[PDB]
Amino acid sequence: KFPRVKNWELGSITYDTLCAQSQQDGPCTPRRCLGSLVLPRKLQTRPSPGPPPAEQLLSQARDFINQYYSSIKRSGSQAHEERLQEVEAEVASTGTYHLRESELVFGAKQAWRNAPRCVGRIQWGKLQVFDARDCSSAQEMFTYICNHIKYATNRGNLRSAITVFPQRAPGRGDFRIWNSQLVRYAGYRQQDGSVRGDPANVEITELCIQHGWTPGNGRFDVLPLLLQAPDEAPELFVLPPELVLEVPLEHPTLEWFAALGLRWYALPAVSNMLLEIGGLEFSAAPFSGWYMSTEIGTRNLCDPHRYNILEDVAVCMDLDTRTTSSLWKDKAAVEINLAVLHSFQLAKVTIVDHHAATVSFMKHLDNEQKARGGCPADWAWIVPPISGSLTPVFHQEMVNYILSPAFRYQPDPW
Amino acid sequence: GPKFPRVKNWELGSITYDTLCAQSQQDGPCTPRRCLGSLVLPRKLQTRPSPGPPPAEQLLSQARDFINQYYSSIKRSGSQAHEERLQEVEAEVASTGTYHLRESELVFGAKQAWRNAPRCVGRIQWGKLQVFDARDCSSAQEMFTYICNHIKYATNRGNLRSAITVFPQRAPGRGDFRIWNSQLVRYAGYRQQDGSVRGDPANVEITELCIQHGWTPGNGRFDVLPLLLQAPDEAPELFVLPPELVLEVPLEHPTLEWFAALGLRWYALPAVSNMLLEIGGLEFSAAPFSGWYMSTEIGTRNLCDPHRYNILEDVAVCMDLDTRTTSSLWKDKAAVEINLAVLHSFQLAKVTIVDHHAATVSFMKHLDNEQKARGGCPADWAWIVPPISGSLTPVFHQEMVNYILSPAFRYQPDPW
Ligand code: HEM
Ligand code: HEM
Ligand SMILES: O=[N+]([O-])c1cccc2c(Br)n[nH]c12
Ligand SMILES: O=[N+]([O-])c1cccc2c(Br)n[nH]c12
Ligand SMILES: O=[N+]([O-])c1cccc2c(Br)n[nH]c12
Numbered sequence: 130k131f132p133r134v135k136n137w138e139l140g141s142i143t144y145d146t147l148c149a150q151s152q153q154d155g156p157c158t159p160r161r162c163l164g165s166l167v168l169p170r171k172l173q174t175r176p177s178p179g180p181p182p183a184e185q186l187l188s189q190a191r192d193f194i195n196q197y198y199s200s201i202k203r204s205g206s207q208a209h210e211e212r213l214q215e216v217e218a219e220v221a222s223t224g225t226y227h228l229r230e231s232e233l234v235f236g237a238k239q240a241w242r243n244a245p246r247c248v249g250r251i252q253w254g255k256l257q258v259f260d261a262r263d264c265s266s267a268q269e270m271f272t273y274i275c276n277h278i279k280y281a282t283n284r285g286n287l288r289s290a291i292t293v294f295p296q297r298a299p300g301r302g303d304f305r306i307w308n309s310q311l312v313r314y315a316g317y318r319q320q321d322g323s324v325r326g327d328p329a330n331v332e333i334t335e336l337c338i339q340h341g342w343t344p345g346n347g348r349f350d351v352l353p354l355l356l357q358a359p360d361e362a363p364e365l366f367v368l369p370p371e372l373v374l375e376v377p378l379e380h381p382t383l384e385w386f387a388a389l390g391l392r393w394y395a396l397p398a399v400s401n402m403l404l405e406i407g408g409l410e411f412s413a414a415p416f417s418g419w420y421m422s423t424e425i426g427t428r429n430l431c432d433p434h435r436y437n438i439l440e441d442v443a444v445c446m447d448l449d450t451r452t453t454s455s456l457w458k459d460k461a462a463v464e465i466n467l468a469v470l471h472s473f474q475l476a477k478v479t480i481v482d483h484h485a486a487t488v489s490f491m492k493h494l495d496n497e498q499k500a501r502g503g504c505p506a507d508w509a510w511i512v513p514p515i516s517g518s519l520t521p522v523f524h525q526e527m528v529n530y531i532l533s534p535a536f537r538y539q540p541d542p543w
Numbered sequence: 544g545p546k547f548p549r550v551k552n553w554e555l556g557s558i559t560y561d562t563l564c565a566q567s568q569q570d571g572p573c574t575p576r577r578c579l580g581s582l583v584l585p586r587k588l589q590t591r592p593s594p595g596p597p598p599a600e601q602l603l604s605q606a607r608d609f610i611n612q613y614y615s616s617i618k619r620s621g622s623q624a625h626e627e628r629l630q631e632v633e634a635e636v637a638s639t640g641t642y643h644l645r646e647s648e649l650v651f652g653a654k655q656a657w658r659n660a661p662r663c664v665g666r667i668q669w670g671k672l673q674v675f676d677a678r679d680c681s682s683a684q685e686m687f688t689y690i691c692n693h694i695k696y697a698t699n700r701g702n703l704r705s706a707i708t709v710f711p712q713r714a715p716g717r718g719d720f721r722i723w724n725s726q727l728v729r730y731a732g733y734r735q736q737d738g739s740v741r742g743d744p745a746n747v748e749i750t751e752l753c754i755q756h757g758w759t760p761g762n763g764r765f766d767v768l769p770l771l772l773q774a775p776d777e778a779p780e781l782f783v784l785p786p787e788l789v790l791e792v793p794l795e796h797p798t799l800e801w802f803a804a805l806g807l808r809w810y811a812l813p814a815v816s817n818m819l820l821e822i823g824g825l826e827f828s829a830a831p832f833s834g835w836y837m838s839t840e841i842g843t844r845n846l847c848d849p850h851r852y853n854i855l856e857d858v859a860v861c862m863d864l865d866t867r868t869t870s871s872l873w874k875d876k877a878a879v880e881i882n883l884a885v886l887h888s889f890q891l892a893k894v895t896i897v898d899h900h901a902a903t904v905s906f907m908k909h910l911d912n913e914q915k916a917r918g919g920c921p922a923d924w925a926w927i928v929p930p931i932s933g934s935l936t937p938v939f940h941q942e943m944v945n946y947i948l949s950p951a952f953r954y955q956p957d958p959w
């Protein structure tokens with residue numbers, strides 16, 4: 130049952146014993162591996178057409194409360210026993226329960242630590258957790274979100290944070306942020322199918338306009354937020370521009386790069402995932418860290434279905450875009466990534482390159498092997514999208530599995 | 544909807560369902576509880592040499608399935624000829640414990656093993672494999688001749704041709720034919736007294752075995768190894784490939800004049816020789832196969848892996864890059880130029896080579912061909928996406944289903 134895990138660069142072997150604590154199934158079976166699939170249809174987080182089975186809920190809740198008491202080393206303490214009894218009395222009478230703020234803080238940090246696709250987990254213990262479960266309206270949601278962005282941005286010296294809105298409840302609508310990130314650029318279907326802006330955001334852009342936003346016409350128009358309180362239409366909120374830190378892109382030696390008029394925002398803030406702690410589900414719990422430079426330079430600017438800028442930059446570079454074998458894509462991608470690093474560095478905004486980040490992730494794997502006997506990791510997401518085998522994680526076998534607390538995908542609210 | 548894995552392409556937003564995986568009758572290393580997809584050698588395909596034949600029923604089940612695939616492929620399933628072949632195979636197993644393939648069956652089988660290889664990006668070529676039948680081989684000397692003829696056919700003065708040479712199958716009460724080398728052409732790895740390795744560090748063990756068996760070692764960075772060839776129940780015998788049969792390409796760069804001075808080179812012919820070819824339960828323990836290179840394999844993996852030639856820093860220093868900080872992207876810049884020199888050099892030498900952009904575009908066509916032909920394609924995303932510029936290629940954006948279909952190429956334990 131326990132996997133032998135090899136590092137092919139160093140020749141070292143470890144055994145993952147943490148995976149036996151996984152209680153939830155992924156999509157692979159012995160007859161076929163589906164590890165490269167991006168989204169589930171089983172791992173998701175089905176609405177509440179009535180509360181979960183109480184035996185299922187209290188099973189997850191007791192395991193979480195046990196995780197917490199172990200975490201502060203007061204396992205078996207009277208507090209531990211008294212807490213377990215409170216949670217059980219609550220689920221027996223009401224079909225649900227509530228977490229103490231200290232439990233919430235531990236849970237959100239553990240969800241990050243457990244996220245198999247995140248290469249930045251060496252930071253997992255340094256997470257600012259904002260409790261927003263005292264929130265009864267979309268306008269209040271907006272205030273908490275602005276305060277999050279202000280904290281996390283910190284004038285360019287970014288700090289990881291999460292804001293947790295009230296949990297799901299059976300027979301009642303969810304709190305939701307419709308946006309997939311707190312800061313994203315509009316995507317406008319221009320006449321002829323083609324898109325101005327970020328093609329990934331055409332649908333959310335359209336929803337914003339249909340909910341009364343007056344659209345811009347630029348390539349980098351920051352989107353308004355669509356926030357929804359239970360069983361209400363989402364409400365539109367424009368972020369105050371002074372809250373949204375952006376970095377114009379320039380290259381340290383190619384004069385013309387700046388003329389491309391590229392920019393990116395500083396704060397990566399994922400806002401449409403579900404945070405699951407002890408069987409409780411937080412449908413609105415936006416979290417933010419800082420960027421790995423390849424995410425901007427390679428995926429967001431160079432993906433064919435995104436800004437797709439490779440050929441423009443290659444032409445500016447005078448490269449031979451006529452045959453694959455000139456490696457024009459590869460050369461242009463490196464300079465684009467270099468421009469991102471130089472530019473963030475120049476602006477004094479937190480950024481980490483993919484070599485530094487994967488070196489730290491290897492340190493994190495070693496830390497975790499000692500602390501818990503393993504670390505769930507999804508190779509396809511941990512290895513960067515350029516220069517894969519040039520980083521140490523490529524040569525490291527990994528084991529993927531789901532531990533709780535967890536961040537999960539959930540259906541779009543529309 | 545369909546009770547099969549749903550597969551998405553995120554660049555194009557298209558969906559397919561893989562029904563082919565329902566034919567898999569050999570399990571992988573994953574469970575609903577945890578994915579082991581990134582492990583390089585799962586103990587599954589792998590084969591711990593069974594002292595004697597297969598269980599008659601196990602072997603018969605695999606043989607029947609294979610013969611059924613064969614008659615389906617020529618469109619005669621359920622036919623008189625098909626029934627008779629199943630009877631003959633059953634009778635031969637009952638009387639001898641094993642059976643033998645017709646020539647056309649071996650050819651079908653060998654092509655199907657390549658088509659079925661989930662880690663191979665070059666599978667659009669699968670129908671154009673040249674199958675050399677060497678099942679009459681009876682000595683190590685004869686194995687060497689067969690291998691020299693393969694190498695000459697396959698290399699073809701630089702216009703490479705895919706080929707496989709199949710030596711006699713494993714048999715009850717008899718040792719195996721084995722090629723000890725992992726490729727027909729490999730460079731030596733020599734352990735230094737100070738602990739470094741000169742040459743290819745991946746090949747220290749095979750290099751020391753060649754020496755232990757009588758080879759007189761060189762001490763260069765790119766010394767072609769001799770072959771250690773083993774006929775049933777004999778010690779391996781050593782053969783030196785005549786140099787004129789081993790085509791090599793000295794590496795230069797199109798604009799960086801100093802690159803040629805580094806004295807780097809690579810061989811033209813990638814020819815895997817230590818895998819097991821399995822067809823209908825029969826095991827061809829010696830069945831070397833060869834194609835042509837994808838340039839990243841040479842330029843990125845063989846020259847720049849930290850546990851291989853590890854040349855990145857040296858080239859980066861020559862390019863005057865800042866190797867003392869990660870954010871200069873010195874590794875990335877050097878890697879791009881090493882891969883460009885590999886493509887340029889092979890192109891200049893008129894030696895077949897394919898860049899990773901062209902290879903992955905053709906693999907996307909292969910996937911579309913196979914969706915129609917078989918309802919899916921087993922594919923191992925971590926091996927199909929190239930080791931540089933991964934998301935710059937179409938395959939990155941394609942979700943993949945990985946599973947084991949037979950006929951198959953499998954790992955097998957080293958002969959020593
Ligand atoms: C501190 C710096 C951080 C860096 C540099 C970083 C980097 C990454 C990268 C490169 C990805 C793979 C790409 C993706 O899935 O979108 C990722 C994914 C992820 N990260 Fe991190 N991360 C950081 C902070 C955070 C924080 C603070 C959390 C949570 C509290 C977090 C949770 C996750 C999750 C859940 C994913 C999976 C996203 C998905 O499935 O779409 N990360 N991270
Ligand atoms: C025509 C050109 C070909 C190209 C460009 C090519 C390219 C590749 C690449 C890049 C790999 C991944 C690296 C690896 O797994 O070692 C690979 C793997 C493989 N190829 Fe191909 N291939 C070609 C022909 C062949 C042929 C002729 C066969 C067999 C008849 C073959 C069978 C396989 C197998 C079995 C693997 C997996 C090796 C392993 O797991 O160690 N390929 N190929
Ligand atoms: O840097 N990233 O590439 C990246 C990707 C996805 C999520 C996050 C967060 Br939250 N911080 N950085 C992230
Ligand atoms: O070494 N690894 O751990 C590992 C995992 C997945 C793919 C590859 C390839 Br291709 N070489 N090494 C790999
Ligand atoms: O090009 N390649 O990278 C490559 C890798 C592994 C096996 C083969 C064969 Br056989 N032809 N090319 C191959």
Ligand SMILES: O=[N+]([O-])c1cccc2c(Br)n[nH]c12
Nearest residue numbers: 165509510553939940941942
């Ligand atoms: O698109 N994909 O099929 C796919 C598979 C595996 C990982 C990734 C990432 Br990271 N982006 N897209 C991916």
Ligand SMILES: [Zn+2]
Nearest residue numbers: 157162573578
């Ligand atoms: Zn898997």
